[PDB]
Design a protein around this ligand. Structure first.
Ligand SMILES: *Cc1ccc(S(=O)(=O)N2CCOc3cc(Cl)ccc32)cc1
Ligand SMILES: *Cc1ccc(S(=O)(=O)N2CCOc3cc(Cl)ccc32)cc1
Ligand SMILES: [Cl-]
Ligand SMILES: [Cl-]
Ligand SMILES: [Cl-]
Ligand SMILES: [Cl-]
Ligand SMILES: [Mg+2]
Ligand SMILES: [Mg+2]
Lengths: 228, 9, 228, 9
């Protein structure tokens, strides 16, 4: 669809779309950029993630509103409209997963890129799991688990405990354990051990790296306070 | 609870 | 597009879409409802207006961000993307104007409905005027003026000076004078006379009518403070 | 300046 636009122009327009808070456009520009077939830089990976996280985040919030109304109600309209939003959400998740599978993950050899993409894979299966009810729901949960686990294994071997991607991965995998997998103790354990191991490595960091690591540590702490 | 935001803000 | 859905289901889904903050969906449901060909009730007119005002409001905010970047810049990408957003915005305004012309206005005989729709007509021509530059820009401005003027003439003959539709019309026409027509004195005069004539009629109102009228009077006052 | 909002809020 964006096949006729230059890669650099798609990236530029994704940055403009973010500034304009046009996240659907942003996501379309970034999908076009990925489909050029070249690997993404650090900055470009963040544009891709920001775009789709915002699009699906809005769909999730709408699905939650509609699901609440539907549950209180229990004509067909609320269920029909919740189903419409759900199908759209699933479509976006499938699109992101398709970009990761064709071919971002397989071409990502550096630990930072590969962990980034596997964290995304876990997240979009997690979003699918939030709305799943059918014969494949266990399998969707396991797909999220498997992606997060591979990312964790690489991160623990290849990155310091304060690395922001490693920290964000652990944060999100802990949310998976608490909210999806019905494993609140695993969630609490992961968040605690992540926080403590990062704390012990902060002394190695510059001011700017310290700010990033402590920002995510505070999110881990905020969850621990909510969960305990 | 909360997952990571897309940007530091 | 919504031709196979019942009118009542479209209205119900527009209300759900508003609760879910899905304003594009809201607008599509309300377009489908209008296209059933029946007149709209007071509540339904407000759903139609809310939906499109929110959609175009987001487009306007994005266009302003992009137009600012473009003006600071003065490759083709910023202009191209501003043009894309502009074309989309114009398309939505044309859609709303088309609903008003086919056939909401011509079937509206009561003063309240006819003023409501002519106020909308003025507003969507005003939004077109905000982005216009070509040979038709004077004509777009005059189309907004003409719609607002007809609404004003009916409102002054048929509604009390505290009527909220009459007040909102005067508010928006005053914004037209200030921001579009380069007539700040006309804008200030209209806002002042509207405010004062409403103030003098508040004694006739119930508590709930008083709250609505004073809410809009405060918006008139906020503009007067900004403009003077 | 400001035009009318779509809802009282
Ligand atoms: C999943 C993930 C974790 C960290 C980063 S980042 O360090 O590049 N960065 C930019 C994206 O948004 C952030 C939010 C927070 Cl709270 C901390 C750092 C970042 C990117 C992706
Ligand atoms: C254009 C217009 C003016 C007033 C109304 S209303 O009185 O029905 N009402 C509902 C819509 O949003 C409002 C905002 C404010 Cl500030 C006051 C009243 C209303 C509808 C349309
Ligand atoms: Cl639907
Ligand atoms: Cl590679
Ligand atoms: Cl474009
Ligand atoms: Cl009629
Ligand atoms: Mg090229
Ligand atoms: Mg019917």
């Amino acid at each position: 669809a964006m096949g006729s636009m230059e890669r650099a122009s798609l990236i530029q327009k994704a940055k403009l779309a973010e500034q304009a808070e046009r996240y659907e456009d942003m996501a379309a520009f970034m999908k076009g950029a990925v489909e050029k077939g070249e690997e993404l830089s650090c900055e470009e990976r963040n544009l891709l993630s920001v775009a789709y996280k915002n699009v699906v985040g809005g769909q999730r919030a709408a699905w939650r509103v509609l699901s609440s109304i539907e549950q209180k109600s229990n004509g067909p309209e609320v269920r029909e409209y919740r189903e419409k939003v759900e199908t759209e959400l699933q479509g976006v998740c499938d699109t992101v997963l398709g970009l990761l599978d064709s071919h971002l993950i397989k071409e990502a050899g550096d630990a930072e890129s590969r962990v980034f993409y596997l964290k995304m894979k876990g997240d979009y299966y997690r979003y699918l799991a939030e709305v799943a009810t059918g014969d494949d729901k266990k399998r969707i949960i396991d797909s999220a688990r498997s992606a997060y686990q591979e990312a964790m294994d690489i991160s623990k071997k290849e990155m310091p405990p304060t690395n922001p991607i490693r920290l964000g991965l652990a944060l999100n995998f802990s949310v998976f354990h608490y909210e999806i997998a019905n494993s609140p103790e695993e969630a609490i354990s992961l968040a605690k051990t992540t926080f403590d191991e990062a704390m012990a490595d902060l002394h190695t960091l510059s001011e700017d790296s310290y700010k990033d690591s402590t920002l995510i540590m505070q999110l881990l702490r905020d969850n621990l306070t909510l969960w305990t | 609870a909360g997952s990571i935001p897309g940007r530091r803000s």
